[PDB]
Paper text:
For crystallization of the RTQ151M:DNA binary complex, the previously developed 38-mer DNA aptamer was applied, albeit with 3 base substitutions to trap guanosine analogue ETV-TP at the N-site. The final refined model contains amino acid residues 3–553 for chains A/C (p66 subunit), 4–427 for chains B/D (p51 subunit) except 214–230 owing to poor electron density, and two DNA aptamers (nucleotides from −1 to 33 for chain E and from −4 to 33 for chain F). In the previously reported RTWT:DNA structure, the side-chain of Gln151 interacted with the adenine base of the dA0 via ordered solvent molecules, stabilizing base stacking with the cytosine base of dC127. In contrast, the present structure showed that the hydrophobic side-chain of Met151 keeps nearby residues, the base moiety of dC0, and solvent away, and that the cytosine base of dC0 is deviated by approximately 35° relative to the guanine base of dG1. Consequently, the present structure of the RTQ151M:DNA binary complex exhibits a more open conformation than that of the previously reported RTWT:DNA structure. These results indicated that the bulky, hydrophobic Met151 side-chain increases the flexibility of the N-site and forms a distinct conformational state in the absence of dNTP/NRTI. In contrast, apparent local conformational changes were observed in the β2-β3 region of the finger domain between the binary and ternary complexes with maximum atomic displacement of approximately 8.5 Å.
Conceptually, HBV and HIV-1 RTs share common metal-dependent dNTP-binding and catalytic mechanism of nucleotide addition to the 3′-end of the primer DNA, whereas amino acid differences around the N-site probably result in different NRTI sensitivities. In this study, we showed that the Q151M mutation of HIV-1 RT confers high ETV and EFdA sensitivity upon HIV-1. The HIV-1 RTQ151M further enabled crystal structure analysis of HIV-1 RT in complex with ETV-TP. We also determined the crystal structure of HIV-1 RTQ151M in complex with DNA, DNA:dGTP, and DNA:ETV-TP, which revealed that ETV-TP is bound at the N-site, directly pushing the Met184 side chain.
Residue numbers in the entry:
A (entry chain B): 4 to 213, 231 to 427
B (entry chain A): 3 to 553
Write the structure that this text describes.
């Protein structure tokens, strides 16, 4: 006997009408196995075309657990869904999660499958399984339960989740758990083996009612750097002045008066110009300013987070997170460690997951990404490398590198 | 017929259609009456009266050759008011996706839409009226009890209904492949033909319980099978013959028909090109406008006609072997590909000829072709093929190292098939020793459309060119164009245009812009170019002098 929570789309908004994209054989087969089992257990229901909504569906395999995980890209639905700040069912973000030795992320999505979803809202959850070579029409299901990937499922299940974790959290006051979407983030200052075990304990407790290891303490900001040389060419100084001129819309009191005058006239780019002692002083002050974080930048919870990424070559990827332009909350450098080093798209997709995971840990939500990639190149391959149960918002930018400011 | 109906609604706030009946000839009226009577006897429609306020026009159209009359109900008004549907036909089966089968049958169901009942509460909306002759009676009204032809919801509701009906049979017979396209069923098996035929009529019996006939006229038991516009032989498949227009005088619409036929032919006929013929479609203003074929369009047409003269076939898919995709470059942004598993035995062919973007190069277009083929391969075979590409590994390496966007191509082998895809120039990463340095700048008057482009150099040279009917961005491109024009084989250029720098850094080899094209031509002829940026109006070096000069 369970009662549903009445849910609405936002005023003036209809449900999602997003087309299914083509799927590989092994993802189709996995989805057909998963969905017939879910249909049997009443979690979803076979529907027809009289339901005009749709959301793409695909599958992923985590690296350490090699069973397939179904993933319905409810980004569109979540945007159209009522806020739960208003039904007072939202989840606060605990500071201090970012200050922990290690954070372990657990897929807690199944727990949502024990709570029915408002009968009048299920039509918005429809998805379609494709068929190889279009042998058959698509097969359509809608959810009867809180679906995984829906922003409303953590909100509605929130009361229940708090009860489940009350013993663990009173038994373990120093552990901090934050729930984001289908994920539970657990952080502790204990040494790995012990931390892990308490993760095992949590897993067992969770199983009874019904990971990825992060070390935030060792994420480090990578600031802007100026080159250090002894001999400088006109082109070096030009490159230097243009970089500092750009950094002056972020940092305060950066000057180029002295270095710029070193360039008076119409000079060959290869001509070495010795530094005035004054320009050496100008360079010094600027270097010092670039050294420490910017003053006056604070997170605003009412504004969205935005992330920019630049490819730097040799497996390196710079990124900045901000809410307002030039008021960066965090600047960083992502590096690939696989060893293959062959695939830009896989690297970027891993960079996006890692940057989004940091934002979840730091601020409790993911940013909208500005991705340095062709839409069509990204859409050809990214699902081959996705491993999160959430998907962030993104858009595609083609911005040539004016100055290589971040490297 | 005993399938449960699918409930359907009008769009919210909307009532049914109320469209007047166009007057009609008695001959048409008489044929409509005959047809309607038969449908009524069969239960497809029922007589209604004037207390139903809805209406949709009915027209009478002639048959293919018989002269028999055909009933059409123009549901355009009802369709706009009917709810949306999520369509379940996601694509078109392709014969290159079939595996070889020992026994094959192609069958249709007869009167497919008229075998599926329509939602009882929705029936009133489908009201149509046969007019009297010159208003002798108000006329005879009918509504549909079944899926009407021409109604927006009929294809999806039929498709879904037929999926539900075939579901029990598919599950029970998992080694029987059934391709279900609307009312058309392809059935392949590895059974002996005696047992295969047994299974066929078990299937027919199952469809008959659910009210789907399978008429013998539409039952094909021997190769070649006519299927989805193709011919299925046991080892090979064929497109049904493609006939191209053969006009002396061509209109826009004729050309549109020709390009279309050629696109269709390109799934199996390798090397089809349509760029020159399609160019004829640009900037035209009527479907009836006569368009003279250019010389290029005629040569392209004759090349294609040669290709079509020869017979071709595709083969079927064997899952135990790899898929291989091979691409050749044809020129002017055109690409052609073959997909195969054994050499010289094509599953299918294709072409990629789209111009994406104002400015691009062959490496990006090759990347797009790879993405197109990769998508088509997943649609057809559920996997991505191995590629053979006419691009050196050194070329690909130079591209993705220097280009700032992420990019990738899956596993591929170099194939030596000239012309090869190459980068046509590469900007220097460092300023060139001994090369003259050019400080360029262009500026335009937003209000006047007048501007100037010019440069000053470390060797004391300078020049200003006046420009008319220009823009800011063009004067900057024009400034670089001048520097390239007046400089030697090695040159350092310093611009303040992020715009112009961004175009050129991406090493385009073609552009919809003649000015950019000229620049590309110039870049290809240089030995070394270094292109650097400075911020404008900061009084920096040469930039200040040149900005001063254009003023
Ligand atoms: O990658 C863009 C591509 O993704 C689709 C899936 O079909 O949908 C997503 O696109 C955006 C990514 O942030 C979101 O705005 C959108 O809500 C999400 O569904 C396509 O719509 C889009 O072309």
């Amino acid at each position: 006997p369970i009662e549903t929570v009445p849910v609405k789309l936002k005023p003036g908004m209809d449900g999602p009408k997003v087309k299914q994209w083509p799927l590989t054989e092994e993802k189709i087969k996995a989805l057909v196995e998963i969905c017939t089992e879910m249909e049997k257990e009443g979690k979803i229901s076979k529907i027809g075309p009289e339901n005009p909504y749709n959301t793409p569906v695909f599958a992923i395999k985590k690296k350490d657990s090699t069973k397939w995980r179904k993933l319905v890209d409810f980004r569109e639905l979540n945007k159209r869904t009522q806020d739960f700040w208003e039904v007072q069912l939202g989840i606060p973000h605990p500071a201090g999660l970012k200050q922990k030795k290690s954070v372990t992320v657990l897929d807690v999505g199944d727990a949502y499958f024990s709570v029915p979803l408002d009968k009048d809202f299920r039509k918005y959850t429809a998805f379609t399984i494709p068929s190889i070579n279009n042998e058959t029409p698509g097969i359509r299901y809608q959810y009867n339960v809180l679906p995984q990937g829906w922003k409303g499922s953590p909100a509605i299940f929130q009361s229940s989740m708090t009860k489940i974790l009350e013993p663990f959290r009173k038994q373990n006051p120093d552990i901090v758990i934050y729930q984001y979407m289908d994920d539970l983030y657990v952080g502790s200052d204990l040494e790995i083996g012990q931390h892990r075990t308490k993760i095992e304990e949590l897993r067992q407790h969770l199983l009874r009612w019904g990971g990825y290891e992060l070390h935030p303490d060792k994420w480090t900001v990578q600031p802007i750097v100026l080159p250090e040389k002894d001999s400088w060419t006109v082109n070096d100084i030009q490159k230097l002045v243009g970089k500092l001129n750009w950094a002056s819309q972020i940092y305060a009191g950066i000057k180029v008066r002295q270095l710029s005058k070193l360039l008076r006239g119409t000079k060959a780019l290869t001509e070495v110009v010795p530094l005035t002692e004054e320009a050496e002083l100008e360079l010094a002050e600027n270097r010092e300013i670039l050294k420490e974080p910017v003053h006056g930048v604070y997170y605003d919870p009412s504004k969205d987070l935005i992330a920019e990424i630049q490819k730097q070559g040799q497996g390196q990827w710079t990124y900045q997170i901000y809410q307002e332009p030039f008021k960066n909350l965090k600047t960083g450098k992502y590096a690939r460690m696989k060893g293959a080093h062959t695939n830009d798209v896989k690297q970027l997709t891993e960079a996006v997951q890692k940057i989004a995971t940091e934002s979840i840990v730091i601020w409790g939500k993911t940013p909208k990404f500005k991705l340095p990639i062709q839409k069509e190149t990204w859409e050809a391959w990214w699902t081959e490398y996705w491993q999160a149960t959430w998907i962030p918002e993104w858009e595609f930018v083609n911005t040539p590198p004016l100055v290589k400011l971040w490297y | 017929s005993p399938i449960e109906t699918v409930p359907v609604k009008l769009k919210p706030g909307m009532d049914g259609p109320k469209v007047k009946q166009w007057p009609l000839t008695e001959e048409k009226i008489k044929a409509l009456v005959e047809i309607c009577t038969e449908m009524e006897k069969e239960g497809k429609i029922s007589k209604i009266g004037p207390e139903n306020p809805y209406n949709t026009p009915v027209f009478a159209i002639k048959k293919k050759d018989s002269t028999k009359w055909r009933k059409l109900v123009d549901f355009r008004e009802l369709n706009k008011r009917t709810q949306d549907f999520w369509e379940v036909q996601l694509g078109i089966p392709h014969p290159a996706g079939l595996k070889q089968k020992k026994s094959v049958t192609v069958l249709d169901v007869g009167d497919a839409y008229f075998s599926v009942p329509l939602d009882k509460d929705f029936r009133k909306y489908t009201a149509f009226t046969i007019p009297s002759i010159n208003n002798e009676t108000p006329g005879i009204r009918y509504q549909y009890n079944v899926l009407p032809m021409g109604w927006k919801g009929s294809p999806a509701i039929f498709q879904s209904s037929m999926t539900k009906i075939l579901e029990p049979f598919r599950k029970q017979n998992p080694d029987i492949v059934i391709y279900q396209y609307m009312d058309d069923l392809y059935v392949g098996s590895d059974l002996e033909i005696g047992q295969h035929r047994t299974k066929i009529e078990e299937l027919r019996q199952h469809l008959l319980r659910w009210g789907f006939t399978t008429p013998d006229k539409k039952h094909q038991k021997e190769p070649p099978f006519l299927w989805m516009g193709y011919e299925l032989h046991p080892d090979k498949w064929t497109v049904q013959p493609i006939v191209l227009p053969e006009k002396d005088s061509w209109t826009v619409n004729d050309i549109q028909k020709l390009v279309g036929k050629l696109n269709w032919a390109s799934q199996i006929y390798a090397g089809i090109k349509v760029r020159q013929l399609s160019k004829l479609l640009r900037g035209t203003k009527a479907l009836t406008e006569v368009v003279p074929l250019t010389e290029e369009a005629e040569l392209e047409l004759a090349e294609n006609r040669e290709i079509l003269k020869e017979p071709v076939h595709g083969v079927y898919y064997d899952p135990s072997k790899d898929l291989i995709a091979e691409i050749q470059k044809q020129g002017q942004g055109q690409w052609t590909y073959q997909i195969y598993q054994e050499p010289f035995k094509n599953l299918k062919t294709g072409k990629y000829a789209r111009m994406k973007g104002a400015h691009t190069n062959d490496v990006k277009q090759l990347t797009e072709a790879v993405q197109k083929i990769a998508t088509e391969s997943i649609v057809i075979w559920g996997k991505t093929p191995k590629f053979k590409l006419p691009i050196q590994k050194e070329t690909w390496e130079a591209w993705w190292t220097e280009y700032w966007q992420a990019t990738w191509i899956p596993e591929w082998e170099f194939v030596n098939t000239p012309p090869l895809v190459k980068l046509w120039y590469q900007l220097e990463k460092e300023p060139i020793i001994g090369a003259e340095t050019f400080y360029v700048d262009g500026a335009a008057n937003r209000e006047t459309k007048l501007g100037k482009a010019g440069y000053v150099t470390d060797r004391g040279r300078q020049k200003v060119v006046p420009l008319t009917d220009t823009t800011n961005q063009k004067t900057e491109l024009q400034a670089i164009h001048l520097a390239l024009q007046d400089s030697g084989l090695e040159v350092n250029i310093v611009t303040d245009s992020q715009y112009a720098l961004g175009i050129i850094q991406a090493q385009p080899d073609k552009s919809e812009s003649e000015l950019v094209s000229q620049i590309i031509e110039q870049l290809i002829k240089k030995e070394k170019v270094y292109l650097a940026w400075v911020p404008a109006h900061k009084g920096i070096g040469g930039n200040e002098q040149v900005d001063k000069l254009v003023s």
